[PDB]
Structures are given as C-alpha cells and as structure tokens.
Curated annotation (Swiss-Prot):
Complex and partners: Interacts with SLC4A4. Interaction with SLC4A7 regulates SLC4A7 transporter activity. Interacts with SLC26A6 isoform 4 (via C-terminus cytoplasmic domain).
Protein name listed in UniProt: Carbonic anhydrase 2
Role according to the record: Catalyzes the reversible hydration of carbon dioxide. Can also hydrate cyanamide to urea. Stimulates the chloride-bicarbonate exchange activity of SLC26A6. Essential for bone resorption and osteoclast differentiation. Involved in the regulation of fluid secretion into the anterior chamber of the eye. Contributes to intracellular pH regulation in the duodenal upper villous epithelium during proton-coupled peptide absorption.
Encoding gene (name): CA2
Domain Alpha-carbonic anhydrase: 1-256
Consequence when changing L194A: Reduced CO(2) hydrase activity
GO annotation terms (biological process): angiotensin-activated signaling pathway; carbon dioxide transport; morphogenesis of an epithelium; neuron cellular homeostasis; positive regulation of cellular pH reduction; positive regulation of dipeptide transmembrane transport; positive regulation of synaptic transmission, GABAergic; regulation of chloride transport
Effect listed in the UniProt record for changing Y4F: Enhanced activity
Amino acid sequence: HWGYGKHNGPEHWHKDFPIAKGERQSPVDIDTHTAKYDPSLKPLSVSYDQATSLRILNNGHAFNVEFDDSQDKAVLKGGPLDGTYRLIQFHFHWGSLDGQGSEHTVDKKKYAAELHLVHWNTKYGDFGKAVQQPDGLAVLGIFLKVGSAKPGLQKVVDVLDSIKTKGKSADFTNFDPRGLLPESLDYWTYPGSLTTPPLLECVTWIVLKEPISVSSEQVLKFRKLNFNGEGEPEELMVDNWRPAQPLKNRQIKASFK
Ligand SMILES: Cc1cc(C)cc(NC(=O)Nc2ccc(S(N)(=O)=O)cc2)c1
Ligand SMILES: [Zn+2]
C-alpha cells in the first residue's frame, strides 16, 4: 500500500494511481520570476471566526485536525475562487531535516514543512463529490521555516504525544486556525491535484508568499510521530512530502508584484 518509503513512495504511486503522471499534478516549483502578476485576482477572504475544530487524527501519513463542515462555519472565498469553500481539515508535511519537508518549493527552495488547510466547494454538497470535480477543492498552503516559535501552533504540538501511532485520535475542540496564518495574504495560485494518492486533479492551489516561523522544538515534536500502528516496529513519521512535479501546460499567477 502506498507510503513514503523507498519501496512504496512517490516514484511508485503511478502504478496504482496512473493520474500521478497527469497534466495538473501537485506540488510544483514556484518560479517567482516566471509567475505573472494578475491584477484581476481578488484578495483572499479567510473567514475562520466561527471555525469548529473537532478531532486530531494520525492517519498513518500525517495528522489531520478535522472541522465541522456540515455548515458554513470556516470558509474560504475570493482570490481566484468562485463560490464558497468550507474548511474540512488541515495537516502538514515535514522533513527529517530543517532543510527539507515542504511540497511546493520557491525558486527550488525547500522549507522545513508546509501547512495545508483543505476546503471543499459547497456547490458539490459533500467532500466526496467535490474531489471528483476540477474545481472541487481549494487548499491554502503555508510554508513553515524554523526560527521563533509559532504560539498558535503549540496546542497542536502538545497533543501529538496522544496520537503517536497510526489510527489514534484525540478530541481537539476549540482550536482557532487563525493562529496559524502569517500577516500577509499575498499568494500564488495554479490548478493542481491532491499530493497524496488518489492524486485527484481537483484542487485550486493557493500558496501564501509569507512563511510562518516555528521553533526547532515544535518541528522536532512532529518528527516523533510514527507512521506505524501501535505494537508495530517504530517508523518515524518524517519526510512525508511529495517532490515537485512537472508544471506542463500551466501558469502560476501571483496576487502581488
Ligand atoms: C473522499 C475521500 C474519502 C477518504 C476516506 C479519503 C480521501 N482522501 C483525501 O481527502 N486525501 C487528501 C490528500 C491530499 C490532500 S493535500 N496534501 O493535496 O492537501 C488533501 C486530502 C477522500
Ligand atoms: Zn497536504
């Protein structure tokens, strides 16, 4: 079954998921000199005041903080998007080393980690329908660099002990995802895909220009998670990122100059 190792990793995925070699795969390298400023792009609208977090889950590939998406509580709108997208979960991808871990890269630069806030288009009724549509998801991607601590991340860090292994979950109510955002909402955008199997080509990617800074201790605690389940040999959950994929016939647009 797929993973991130030498025998089941990104180089293998195309055998079960042939869309891995498709025309709008993610992540990509963001070449900042080739991205074009689009003055018709609108500012992002991030409305997280009514967000309702529920649970945090180690799913064997990352950990997801899950939200109540049965109503318009935490939504993303504007930017390149038409319509309203509901926040369903966020998760991260990270490295074994501070110099690697992000999925997108910027002028080939790799960050220590990358946050994905996953949203689905309410015109499609449910997340399972949305992933079957070319405009079904909008994922807001935020780079993490190692430096000073991110205070709004610490409640996530402190619960990871309780979800060490695959299949463990814990209650995670009353978490405010606004504490994970950088100051600026300047962004790059392009059409892409999920970055893990089934690799569906259903995502409008919105990647913020400004990284957030997390401490070395915070990302160190990410790296103590386990890919394995309890009672299985320990496999540290590190390097759960897909490398950059060919841009093919796509243009990355910038909301800024
Ligand atoms: C509809 C459905 C049902 C189940 C049980 C799982 C999934 N998988 C899914 O949503 N995966 C997913 C993969 C990658 C991203 S990313 N890394 O591009 O933000 C988000 C969701 C999708
Ligand atoms: Zn992701």
